Amino acid sequence: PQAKYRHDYRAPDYQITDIDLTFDLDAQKTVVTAVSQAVRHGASDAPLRLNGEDLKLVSVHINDEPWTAWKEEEGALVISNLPERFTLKIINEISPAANTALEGLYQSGDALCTQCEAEGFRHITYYLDRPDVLARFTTKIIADKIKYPFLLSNGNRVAQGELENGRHWVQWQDPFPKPCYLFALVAGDFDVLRDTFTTRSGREVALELYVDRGNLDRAPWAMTSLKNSMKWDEERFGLEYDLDIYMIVAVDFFNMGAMENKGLNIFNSKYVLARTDTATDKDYLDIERVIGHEYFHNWTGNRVTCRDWFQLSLKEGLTVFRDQEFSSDLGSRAVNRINNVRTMRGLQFAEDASPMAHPIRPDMVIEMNNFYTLTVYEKGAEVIRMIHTLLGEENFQKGMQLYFERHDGSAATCDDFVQAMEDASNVDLSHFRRWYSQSGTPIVTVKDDYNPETEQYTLTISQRTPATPDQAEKQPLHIPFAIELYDNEGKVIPLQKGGHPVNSVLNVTQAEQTFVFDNVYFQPVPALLCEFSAPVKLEYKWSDQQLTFLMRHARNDFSRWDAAQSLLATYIKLNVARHQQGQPLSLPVHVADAFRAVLLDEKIDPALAAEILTLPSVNEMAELFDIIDPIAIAEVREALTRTLATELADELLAIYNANYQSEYRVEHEDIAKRTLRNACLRFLAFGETHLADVLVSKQFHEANNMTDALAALSAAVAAQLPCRDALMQEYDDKWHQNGLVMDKWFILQATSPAANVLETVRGLLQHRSFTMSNPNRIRSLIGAFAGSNPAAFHAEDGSGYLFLVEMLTDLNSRNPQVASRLIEPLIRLKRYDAKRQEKMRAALEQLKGLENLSGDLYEKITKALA
Ligand code: NA
Ligand code: NA
Ligand code: NA
Ligand SMILES: [Zn+2]
């Protein structure tokens, strides 16, 4: 598989301006006729090179002349000796029922549907499958009326008719030119929830949510979230929807989460279907986030698209920033910021320390589906958020407006977006651009000095990014480093120097520099990297009392959570080293007291209390270490939970009972009290056994909503309580027919601390609710075991690696995109001890030798074994 490089981008030799598609649809054999209007822009003698994969070519015509000057080569149809402008007609056949990779046109249950991003349209017809070719599409769909009563594509219906032999057809037209990755087709029988949204200028939009028959009970929250997304994008960004119909189709078999195809988004049903007995608070807020995300791509992705796939973050960093701003404005901004920071420090930092590290704008890709990553998405959004911190909201919105004025209707680059921000705001972002080209996590080290003779506080701040496997050279970044200084009363000290205010976002742009602040009338307790102002590791020699002072006094809720994380980090590291020497948990009394004070503080928002009372996950904990000991981390997390359960037993039960709610509401104040109640339940489950078993079994059986039922079931599995096997069997008997609900139960089986977890997991491959044909089931059972139970995945006998090699041996042929997500825990071998690295290298060598190894896995395995 050869690599492609960003620096090789060149404008295409030919453009296509308009394409009229006809599909004669059938699951075994679909016939595609594609009539494209093409224009040559390159040299007279340059052939037209069309991409195509797994197509049966039937005919090639140029201006209705059967063409003889062409050849097929691997991946391509190369057509020579063309006029400057011409009509290309291709007929070819494809077979949706054979498509187990779920890329192109495929079958989801009884429906046919598409996924074209990134390079899936070349699995449908021969085309210029590159996102700087934008064309106006017309799509005619012909199919059996009984099997496929709804025939959908982008845009508006312009024609429809009935044919003999029980077939019918519909034709769609989308007026906005688009790259082919935004094409979609759906055919099937659905229930349809229909609603309307009127834009602020009065455009009436028909909203249509297509779901499998019988699922209309689970559709209204998605529809509500779509309307909420459309209203928010008008209020915050001034953007209205631009078409007449907005369709969303929920399908069960889908690799990419959801997809922003223009006017016809296709979603995995996990991010659409919810009712209070099947979905948790987190499912409702994930549906809100992902509906919002795909809607926000209408502008940041569709009206302005990407010139090439190395520019993916241009739409994904910006659209993830927009989905986080939407969730944070509608809900709790501090809870959203806290959770996005846990994903950055616990999952994205791990990727930036791995063989797959890349800048948010990659320079080299073998398989572009491997680059839909935590780095391009979540680190990409942190980079957009640093532009917002440097510019402020008003200048950032001026930059958005300039970006659309310049680039509406075109494919643009990351650099174009940064240029628009710099030109609209007059803030220089020339050094800032290095965040697009440099991979790895910067480490920012801070030393401080307070001089009582001069009342000056000095911060000496240094930065470095360690080399990564992809880049030997690293340079300083422009790091926006927000601070606040607190006096002995907890009041913020004004930042000034030389009689002038100093902005609290310091511009850390050198390898080392000093900042001096005057009129600091009391030795300060600093809050550093406020709101996680840059995506960096902070090195500061905190005392325990500075951190518990910030937990009591810091003005932004995020800083009080973050200070609690820094305080825990020191004691997680202490106790992992103790575990390695066979010693039990040690924790100072004053650290348990700081968490007691959070439980008993009547003024703290329950939303913030709940997050301070949610320990860092085992993946967050792993990134505190150079070499990860996953068994020490898992057992220290358990011991820390048991120790706080014992020390805080009476306060945890009081707050558990105080936050009981008889009515269930998907409302943010209620979700905060419930998240705090279930944070208390998690500790109580690890307290005295009989009380724990009673509390947890009562909550499971009395719950009036899935958030509380699943919090009790998860606590029974995590604490291995007596009631666990009965509750787990009750849930299977009640819910085995509902795959989305069973995904929660497979994740609890896969992440169980029980000694026999791998045997249980292997047995669940034969479970009635499991199938290797469905990406959600694969991720919930196999992915959760490898990625979310590292203690079992890294069992010392190597059994977890062998199990993953067997599953990847199947998935490499069936669905290489799902296989490449699942291999990720094996590519992190250099973070583990030598004996685990040996076994993980042997597993990767076994997969490198597979017949018909996919490019998706080849790229990751070769980087891991280098
Ligand atoms: Na809010
Ligand atoms: Na993909
Ligand atoms: Na100091
Ligand atoms: Zn996106």
UniProtKB/Swiss-Prot annotation:
GO terms for molecular function, please? alanyl aminopeptidase activity; aminopeptidase activity; identical protein binding; metallopeptidase activity; zinc ion binding
Q: Which residues bind substrate?
A: 117, 257-261
Which reactions fall under this protein's catalytic activity? Answer: Release of an N-terminal amino acid, Xaa-|-Yaa- from a peptide, amide or arylamide. Xaa is preferably Ala, but may be most amino acids including Pro (slow action). When a terminal hydrophobic residue is followed by a prolyl residue, the two may be released as an intact Xaa-Pro dipeptide
4Fe-4S listed as a keyword: no
Cofactor(s) needed by this chain: Zn(2+)
Against InterPro entries, the record matches this protein to: Aminopeptidase_N-like_N, Aminopeptidase_N-like_N_sf, PepN_Ig-like_sf, Peptidase_M1, Peptidase_M1_dom, Peptidase_M1_pepN, Peptidase_M1_pepN_C, Peptidase_M1_pepN_C_sf
Task: Give the note describing cofactor binding and stoichiometry.
Answer: Binds 1 zinc ion per subunit.
- Membrane-protein topology: Peripheral membrane protein
State the Gene Ontology BP annotations: proteolysis
- Which Gene3D superfamilies does the entry link to? 2.60.40.1840, 3.30.2010.30, Neutral Protease Domain 2 (1.10.390.10), Peptidase M1, alanyl aminopeptidase, C-terminal domain (1.25.50.10), tricorn interacting facor f3 domain (2.60.40.1730)
Cellular component GO terms, alphabetical: plasma membrane
Q: Where in the cell is it found?
A: Cell inner membrane
Residues the record marks as active site: 294
In this chain, Zn(2+) is annotated as bound at 293, 297, 316
According to UniProt, where does the site described as Transition state stabilizer lie? 377
Q: Name one Pfam family in it.
A: DUF3458_C
Q: What is its main location?
A: membrane
Per its database record, what is this protein's job?
Answer: Aminopeptidase N is involved in the degradation of intracellular peptides generated by protein breakdown during normal growth as well as in response to nutrient starvation.
Q: What is this protein called?
A: Aminopeptidase N
